Amino acid sequence: FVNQHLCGSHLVEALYLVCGERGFFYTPKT
Amino acid sequence: GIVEQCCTSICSLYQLENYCN
Ligand SMILES: [Mn+2]
Ligand code: NA
């Protein structure tokens, strides 16, 4: 796999693909 | 964290996998 430059909703899409049915947590810094 | 890293730098799919449930 290649490294990634992912901002905004593109990171969410990547997490979805990687994790699949396992689900994931999206937790930006506040 | 990962959200900032992936956007300001780069990140791997292996790093992303740490956020799966
Ligand atoms: Mn875009
Ligand atoms: Na990767």
Curated annotation (Swiss-Prot), chain A:
Traced from the root, the source organism's taxonomic lineage reads: Eukaryota, Metazoa, Chordata, Craniata, Vertebrata
Which organism is the protein's source? Homo sapiens (Human)
What residues of the intact protein does this structure contain? 25 to 54 of 110
Q: How the protein is affected by changing residue 22 to Q?
A: In MODY10; reduces binding affinity to INSR; reduces biological activity; reduces folding properties
Q: What is the effect of changing residue 24 to S?
A: In HPRI; Los-Angeles
Query: What is the protein named?
Result: Insulin B chain
